[PDB]
């Protein structure tokens, strides 16, 4: 566990993002890792950090439709209620929605989950 | 023997016993495992689900070892004796380190002193550096720092170096070994071994290599074997003449030898070893051992201290010499004379 | 039709217990007669006494059978195992898989894990 | 999990005394969820939340290796070097009669108690205690007649009950799915309930008659006694908290005297008005085989070797400071942390153990998973140490021990059924004849369940119950209260569950 | 008339049914009160189960135990049958 | 001697460190039972291991009852060897060769007959039956002359 490519869980995020995720430092150790190039190992980006750099899709309708934007390529079409003063998230892809009726409340919170703008 | 092993550093090992898919919980490193003995210790450790690091030099000669264990079990590391890092990288995840590195004859880059003393020095110093639980170093029979045979002297000084650095060393002294691919029975059935200095009358207590790999496995589990010294010899004493008699009775060939006077043969043997690249069986010191005789040094534990009773070489001549019977006598039963 | 092989024996039912009695002796005799011939075919390094010991034990495990229709299945299996062995269809690993070269107490079993 | 990848095991809940029939869903090494399964005689397709949601405590604080206390630290031991260390201590102490003491906990099964009774008996001890307070002295009800300590009108008997008196028990926190059956009968019929003890927030209506024996005496002499007298299928239910009380001696004679006075109502051809409600799975089965302190002479002999057989809620006065403590169990909790040697045993999702519920139904678990680490079966541990101590026990297999079990009480060989108490009226002797002059103190009845979510080692180690208690303390209705998920005050979420 | 010193428990295994004669239940009906009053410190475990051959156990010191069937015995013959067990 | 572990039972090629000690095995002398397990070729471990014979209860999560129709025979989990974690990937290893197998029978008697003939140890549990009770929609609205014990909400 000498390099950062053998400790950081992902290049974009250092810590684990699941209850059960074995830390990289705890899985790059052992005899099987003694003559190994760490940066040559598969080290993919954490999707938990990426999805949360998306900005909120603002809408006035009570109910929004998300199908993943790909048409048949995306995901099954669903509908998200936006009534709670909170950013509503698509359960398949994580895209954030908010209703403009909470624009003043959300732009008052000390922090949030997604970029409001 | 149990489902719980506790090591000298005190870590526990909760084991699931059988098969190559199970959990032996032990991480071993076996230096010198691509030789003759090394496979039997590696197969024993690997087929009971233990992780085995196999430091190797030539890539193609290590390959038979991977079959011993499951996926991820046998880990190959490429090392050199004079590459301390590769030595340290190989023993630092381990709870036992086997040192089986030896050579009968000098080489252009290793003397007997360089491969035995200095090789053990680096291996033991890494065992000390990373605090590995167990260290079973394999010396030879008749090992003595006061010896005059380079083999018996240099392997006798490495014995003292190992203890001086890591006192809990299990020192193991096997007798000349027989088995499949042994340099005992297969040479007496060969045709190259025609030269000889004595009349093949030197005596020793030959030991099955299979029972020595088993003995090394039991020393890992019997923790009380740490810091001890083991001489692992067979049930009978024979000369090279008595062994060669058994071989002839088995292969049905009646091999012959050319005897030379030692002041004549020894200089030549030192030339063949210096002018040929392969193991020729002939060298100045191997002639000197040829005139020496085996002594079982007392105050040394035995097979009985592992609770093992070795078998006689005679019972094994048919199994290992049958490839060398001529077609006319091949279909015959074992000699059992 | 196609020829039955060298030791092929037609599958027939035992007429009575006397029939079965005589067949089982014939099968045991034929096995122990062949033990010297098994040893050199398969390069067995043990002596023939051990091989015949194992033949005896295989027959002894079916000692206490009092059913004609179970004996005849058993006389079938030995006929096929004899034919298979003598024609050298099986190899040394199969014949050595047949020679084995559980804890003896509760406390021994307990201390090592179950067995 | 997905349901097609789940192995389904039909077992018994041991987290209370009802023996609710459950389905244990496992994916290999790990239990995934606990489901109810139909038993109209016992649980009626319902389980409570602790039975349901505490399974995650089966994977968290487990004992997998023998530990010997050395220099104030717990170090790993081989099974041999732990049984030898136990045997050496016993040999050194030379315990005479009843200086060997055994305390059994809530989750112990009958294959362990019958095995432990046979070990202690041959060591010279009859000192066989129980984990509750007052579990180390003779009990107010004895164990000679089974009707002394059972729910004699069945759990199915509440389906007909017309009048029910409660004596010192909160039926919600003791038998939650039995509490529902009372409500069901109450909504659809003219069932009258009164209670003596601490008031509790109830799912049914009841009359609070008082908190102590004086109130109970007026209760039977007053209108509810006449209601109990006049009714068909009357029902007095004594909680195990009474048996824990100072005046269990006096409470149990008062109730039975009312019953015997009022047979042909209470003791008819087909009815038994007398019930004792157990809140632990091990306790009726303990009574079934005599695993109970017989006399105060035994209880007054200070032990020097104490085995805690799954015991963790033991009173600190029942364990000597200088005694050699051996703890056997599956969780590292209050019992394991005061012992000299710990022996890892099995949990109920990994053993086939017999349990007897509060009414005397004999049920068996089925192992959903194998043993973790180096844990053993508990009755094998007890049998193993009987070798080391010098008195090996005859049986070497579960069938041989279940043959032993069936000649302590033959009902233990009849599974899934409840045997009828033949000599029902013999309950007068230990209940009244043996309980006549009692130094009544007047101390009111207690609330023996302070926290429903924490009642045993498994629950106290469950992250899910830890969230149930904490949310109940502050009232946070939020789903992700101490769980993964995004919140307004938690923009980034958390991986922690239970914290 | 209490027991002999040494009996640590009594254990009767009978059945509710008349499949076996009512004599064990008749003896226990009468015996258990007085046979518990004279020596309250000893457990006399009355255990019954359908189709149980009547039988009695006395457990003695250091784990030893004596069994005797009660099958075919009468309420008097059963009385001496227990009597030899707790008299010495 | 009263169901004893026989420690002299011979071992065969299939006995491992997870094979139970057997109380008894078939030898073909037994009355009226075909000794199939003696001639089947299965190891002796099949006669040291108890099976469970039962009708699976309905899952709590569904109302369909088709998996409750028949009798199922499974093999009990042993204390060691049922599952352990592979050091390499974390996959779940096993040494129990009966863990993924089950038999289905039309009647309870068929299951007993098969287990007797195969030499299995076997335990039967009987299915818990539903207690019938008439259900009337009109109970939802019954008149109450006195205090409403609860307020129904439909
Ligand atoms: C072609 C270019 C020259 C070939 C290599 C010459 C360099 C050399 O070192 O030759 C000496 C060589 C040493 O052989 P060596 O392996 O040390 O002896 C042990 C075997 N018994 O001994 C030899 O002569 C090898 C034969 C060539
Ligand atoms: N076999 C016998 O009759 C007896 C053996 N012994 C000792 O037992 C041990 C094992 O015996 P056996 O297996 O038969 O011996 P082998 O000679 O067959 O094996 C020796 C091992 O040492 C390694 N080795 C030798 N020199 C070096 C070096 N300079 N650097 C790195 N590795 C080196 C070899 O690796 P590589 O193959 O890559 O060269 C080989 O794996 C040896 O130490 C031997 O001296 C003692 C008494 C009798
Ligand atoms: P006496 O009156 O005592 O008669 C002895 C016998 C054995 C006949 C019995 O009294 C008897 O009738 N018992 C029932 C029959 C019986 O024992 N078994 C049925 C015969 S078939 C059988 O036993 C087959 C055994 C296994 C196959 C043959 C053995 C050889 C196996 C391979 C050997 C090595 C190959 C590599
Ligand atoms: Zn979407």
TrEMBL record, chain A:
Q: Which of UniProt's keywords are assigned here?
A: Metal-binding, Ubiquinone, Zinc
* Gene Ontology CC terms, in alphabetical order: mitochondrion
Q: Does the keyword Endoplasmic reticulum apply?
A: no
Q: Which residue ranges are recorded for the region named Disordered? A: 12-39
Looking at the record, the residues that make up the Zinc finger CHCC-type domain are: 62-97
Give the GO biological process terms.
Answer: mitochondrial electron transport, NADH to ubiquinone
Task: Indicate which residues the UniProt annotation says bind Zn(2+).
Answer: 66, 75, 90, 93
| Name used for this protein in its record | NADH-ubiquinone oxidoreductase-like protein
Organism, by scientific name, is: Chaetomium thermophilum (strain DSM 1495 / CBS 144.50 / IMI 039719) (Thermochaetoides thermophila)
Portion held of the full protein: 52 to 149 of 178
UniProtKB/TrEMBL annotation, chain D:
> Which stretches are transmembrane?
none
Is Plastid among the key words of this record? no
Alphabetically sorted, this entry's keywords are: 2Fe-2S, 4Fe-4S, Iron, Iron-sulfur, Metal-binding, NAD, Translocase, Ubiquinone
GO molecular function terms here?
Answer: 4 iron, 4 sulfur cluster binding; metal ion binding; NADH dehydrogenase (ubiquinone) activity; oxidoreductase activity, acting on NAD(P)H
Parts forming coiled coils: none
- Keyword Nuclease present in the record's keywords: the answer is no
> Could you identify this protein by its name?
NADH-ubiquinone oxidoreductase 78 kDa subunit, mitochondrial
Q: Which domain of life is it from?
A: Eukaryota
> What family does the entry list?
Belongs to the complex I 75 kDa subunit family.
Q: Where is the 4Fe-4S Mo/W bis-MGD-type domain?
A: 6-62
Q: Which GO terms describe its biological process?
A: ATP synthesis coupled electron transport
- Cofactor(s) for this protein? [2Fe-2S] cluster; [4Fe-4S] cluster
Instruction: Kindly list the GO CC terms recorded for this protein.
Output: membrane
From TrEMBL, chain E:
Which ranges form a coiled coil?
Answer: none
Cellular compartment(s): Mitochondrion inner membrane
SMART domains cross-referenced by the UniProt entry: L51_S25_CI-B8 (SM00916)
InterPro entries associated with the record: NADH_Ub_cplx-1_asu_su-2, Ribosomal_mL43/mS25/NADH_DH, Thioredoxin-like_sf
Membrane-topology descriptor: Peripheral membrane protein
What's in the GO CC field?
mitochondrial inner membrane
- Database matches in PANTHER family: NADH DEHYDROGENASE [UBIQUINONE] 1 ALPHA SUBCOMPLEX SUBUNIT 2, NADH-UBIQUINONE OXIDOREDUCTASE B8 SUBUNIT
Role played: Accessory subunit of the mitochondrial membrane respiratory chain NADH dehydrogenase (Complex I), that is believed not to be involved in catalysis. Complex I functions in the transfer of electrons from NADH to the respiratory chain. The immediate electron acceptor for the enzyme is believed to be ubiquinone.
Protein family (similarity comment)? Belongs to the complex I NDUFA2 subunit family.
Q: What is this protein called in UniProt?
A: NADH dehydrogenase-like protein
> Which lineage is the organism of this entry classified under, starting from the top rank?
Eukaryota, Fungi, Dikarya, Ascomycota, Pezizomycotina
From TrEMBL, chain F:
Has UniProt tagged this entry with the keyword Transmembrane helix?
no
Main localization, broad class:
mitochondrion
The record's Gene Ontology biological-process terms are: electron transport chain
Give the record's keywords alphabetically: Electron transport, Membrane, Mitochondrion, Mitochondrion inner membrane, Respiratory chain, Transit peptide, Transport, Ubiquinone
Q: Which domain of life is it from?
A: Eukaryota
- What family does the entry list? Belongs to the complex I NDUFS4 subunit family.
What is the name listed in the Swiss-Prot or TrEMBL entry for this protein?
Answer: NADH dehydrogenase [ubiquinone] iron-sulfur protein 4, mitochondrial
Give the species this sequence originates from.
Chaetomium thermophilum (strain DSM 1495 / CBS 144.50 / IMI 039719) (Thermochaetoides thermophila)
What stretch of the whole protein does this chain cover?
57 to 210 of 210
């Amino acid at each position: 566990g000498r390099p950062a490519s053998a400790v950081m869980q992902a290049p974009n995020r250092a810590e684990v993002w699941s209850r059960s995720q074995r830390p990289r430092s705890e899985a790059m150790a052992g005899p099987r890792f003694e003559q190994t190039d760490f940066d040559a190992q598969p080290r993919p980006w954490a999707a938990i950090e990426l999805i949360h750099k998306q900005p909120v899709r603002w809408t006035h309708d009570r109910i929004v439709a998300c199908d993943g934007g790909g048409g048949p390529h995306g995901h099954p079409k669903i509908y998200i209620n936006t009534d709670k003063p909170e950013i509503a998230t698509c359960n398949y892809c994580g895209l954030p929605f908010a209703n403009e009726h909470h624009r003043k409340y959300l732009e008052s919170l000390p922090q949030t989950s997604y970029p409001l703008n | 023997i149990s489902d719980i092993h506790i090591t000298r550093t005190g870590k526990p090992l909760i084991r699931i016993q059988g098969g190559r898919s199970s959990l032996g919980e032990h991480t071993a490193t076996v230096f010198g495992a691509t030789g003759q003995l090394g496979r039997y210790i590696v197969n024993r450790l690997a087929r009971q689900g233990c992780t085995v690091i196999v430091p190797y030099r030539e890539e193609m000669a290590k390959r038979h070892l991977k079959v011993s264990g499951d996926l991820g079990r046998v880990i190959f590391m490429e090392f050199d004796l004079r590459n301390t890092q590769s030595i340290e990288e190989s023993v630092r995840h381990s709870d036992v380190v086997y040192n089986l590195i030896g050579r009968d004859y000098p080489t252009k880059n290793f003397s007997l002193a360089d491969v035995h003393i200095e090789g053990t020095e680096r291996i033991v110093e890494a065992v000390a550096k990373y605090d590995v639980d167990r260290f079973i170093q394999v010396s030879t029979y008749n090992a003595n720092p006061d010896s005059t045979c380079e083999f018996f002297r240099t392997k006798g000084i490495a014995e003292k170096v190992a203890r001086h650095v890591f006192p809990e060393t299990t020192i193991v002294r096997p007798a000349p070994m027989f088995g499949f691919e042994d340099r005992l029975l297969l040479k007496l059935a060969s045709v190259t071994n025609l030269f000889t200095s004595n009349h093949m009358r030197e005596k020793f207590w030959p030991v099955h290599v299979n029972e020595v790999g088993e003995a090394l496995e039991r020393m890992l589990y019997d923790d009380s074997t740490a810091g001890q010294t083991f001489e692992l010899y067979g049930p009978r004493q024979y000369s090279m003449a008595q062994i060669a008699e058994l071989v002839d009775r088995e292969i049905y060939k009646k091999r012959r030898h050319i005897n030379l006077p030692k002041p004549i043969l020894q200089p030549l043997a030192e030339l063949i070893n210096r002018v040929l690249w392969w193991d020729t069986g002939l060298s100045r010191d191997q002639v000197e051992r040829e005139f020496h005789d085996q002594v079982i040094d007392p105050t040394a534990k035995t097979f009985k201290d592992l609770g093992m009773e070795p078998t006689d070489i005679s019972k094994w001549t048919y199994h290992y010499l049958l490839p060398y019977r001529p077609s006319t006598y091949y279909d015959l039963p074992p000699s059992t004379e | 039709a196609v020829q039955p092989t060298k030791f092929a024996v037609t599958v027939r039912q035992s007429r009575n217990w006397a029939d079965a009695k005589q067949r089982v002796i014939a099968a045991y005799r034929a096995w122990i007669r062949a033990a010297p011939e098994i040893q050199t075919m398969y390069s067995i390094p043990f002596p023939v006494s051990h091989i015949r010991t194992r033949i005896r034990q295989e027959f002894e495990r079916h000692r206490y059978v009092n059913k004609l229709n179970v004996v005849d299945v058993l006389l079938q299996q030995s006929n096929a195992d004899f034919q298979e062995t003598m024609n050298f269809w099986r190899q040394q690993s199969h014949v050595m898989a047949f020679f084995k070269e559980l804890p003896s107490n509760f406390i021994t079993g307990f201390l090592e894990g179950r067995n | 999990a997905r349901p097609w990848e789940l192995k389904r095991t039909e077992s018994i809940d041991v987290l209370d005394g009802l023996g609710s029939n459950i389905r244990v869903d496992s994916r290999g090494l790990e239990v995934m969820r606990i489901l109810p399964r139909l038993n109209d005689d016992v649980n009626e397709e319902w389980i409570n939340d602790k039975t349901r949601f505490a399974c995650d405590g089966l994977k968290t604080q487990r004992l997998t290796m023998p530990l010997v206390r050395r220099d104030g630290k717990f170090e790993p031991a081989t099974w041999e070097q732990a049984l030898t260390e136990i045997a050496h201590a016993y040999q050194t102490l030379a315990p005479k009669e009843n200086e060997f003491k055994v305390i059994a906990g809530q989750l112990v099964e009958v294959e362990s108690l019958v095995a432990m009774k046979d070990l202690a008996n041959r060591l010279g001890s009859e000192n066989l205690a129980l984990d509750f307070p007052g579990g180390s002295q003779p009990l107010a009800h004895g164990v000679d007649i089974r009707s002394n300590y059972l729910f004699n009108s069945k759990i199915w008997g509440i389906e007909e009950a017309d009048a029910i008196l409660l004596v010192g028990t909160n039926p919600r926190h003791e038998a939650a799915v039995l509490n529902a059956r009372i409500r069901k009968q109450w909504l659809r019929s003219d069932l009258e309930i009164a209670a003596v003890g601490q008031p509790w927030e109830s799912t049914f209506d009841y009359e609070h008659l008082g908190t102590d024996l004086a109130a109970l005496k007026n209760a039977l002499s007053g209108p509810f006694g006449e209601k109990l007298k006049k009714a068909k299928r009357p029902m007095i239910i004594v909680g195990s908290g009474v048996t824990e009380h100072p005046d269990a001696k006096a409470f149990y004679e008062t109730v039975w005297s009312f019953v015997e006075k009022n047979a042909s109502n209470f003791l008819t051809e087909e009815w038994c008005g007398y019930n004792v409600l157990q809140r632990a799975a091990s306790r009726a089965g303990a009574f079934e085989v005599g695993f109970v302190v017989p006399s105060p002479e035994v209880a007054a002999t200070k032990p020097k070797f104490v085995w805690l057989l799954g015991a963790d809620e033991f009173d600190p006065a029942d364990v000597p400071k200088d005694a050699f403590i051996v703890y056997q169990g599956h969780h590292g909790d209050r019992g394991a942390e005061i012992a000299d040697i710990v022996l890892p045993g099995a949990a109920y999702t990994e053993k086939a153990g017999t349990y007897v519920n509060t009414e005397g139904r004999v049920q068996m678990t089925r192992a959903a998973t194998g043993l973790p680490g180096a844990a053993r079966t508990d009755w094998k541990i007890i049998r193993a140490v009987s070798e080391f101590l010098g008195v090996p026990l005859p049986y070497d297999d579960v069938a041989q021990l279940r043959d032993r079990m069936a000649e302590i009480s033959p009902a233990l060989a009849a599974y899934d059924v409840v045997e009828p108490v033949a000599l029902r009226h013999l309950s007068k002797v230990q209940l009244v004849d043996q309980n006549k002059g009692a130094k009544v103190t007047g101390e009111p009845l207690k609330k023996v369940v302070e926290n429903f979510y924490f009642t045993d080692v498994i629950s106290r180690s469950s992250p899910t119950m830890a969230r149930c208690s904490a949310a109940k303390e502050t009232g946070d209705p939020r789903t992700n209260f101490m769980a993964p998920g995004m919140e307004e005050d938690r923009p980034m979420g958390q991986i922690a569950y239970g914290a | 008339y209490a027991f002999a010193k040494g009996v640590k428990e009594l254990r009767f295994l009978f059945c509710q049914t008349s499949q076996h004669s009512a004599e064990a239940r008749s003896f226990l009906n009468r015996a258990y009160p007085i046979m518990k009053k004279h020596n309250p410190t000893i457990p006399i475990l009355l255990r019954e189960a359908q189709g149980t051959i009547p039988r009695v156990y006395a457990r003695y010191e250091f784990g030893r135990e004596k069994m005797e069937s009660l099958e075919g015995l009468t309420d008097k013959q059963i009385e001496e049958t227990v009597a030899k067990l707790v008299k010495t | 001697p009263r169901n004893a572990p026989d420690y002299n039972v011979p071992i065969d090629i299939a006995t491992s460190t997870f094979t139970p000690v057997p109380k008894n095995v078939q030898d073909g002398s037994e009355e009226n039972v075909v000794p199939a397990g003696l001639i089947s070729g299965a190891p002796m471990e099949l006669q040291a291991r108890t099976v469970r014979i039962y009708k699976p209860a309905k899952p709590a999560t569904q109302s369909g009852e088709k998996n409750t129709q028949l009798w199922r025979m499974d093999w009990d989990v042993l204390g060691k060897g049922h599952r352990w974690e592979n050091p390499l990937m974390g996959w779940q290893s096993s040494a129990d060769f009966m863990q993924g197998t089950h038999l289905t029978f039309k009647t309870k008697e068929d299951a007993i007959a098969f287990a007797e003939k195969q030499g299995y140890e076997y335990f039967v549990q009987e299915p818990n039956e539903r207690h019938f009770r008439p259900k009337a929609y009109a109970n939802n609205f019954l008149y109450s002359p006195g205090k409403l014990k609860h307020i129904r909400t439909k």
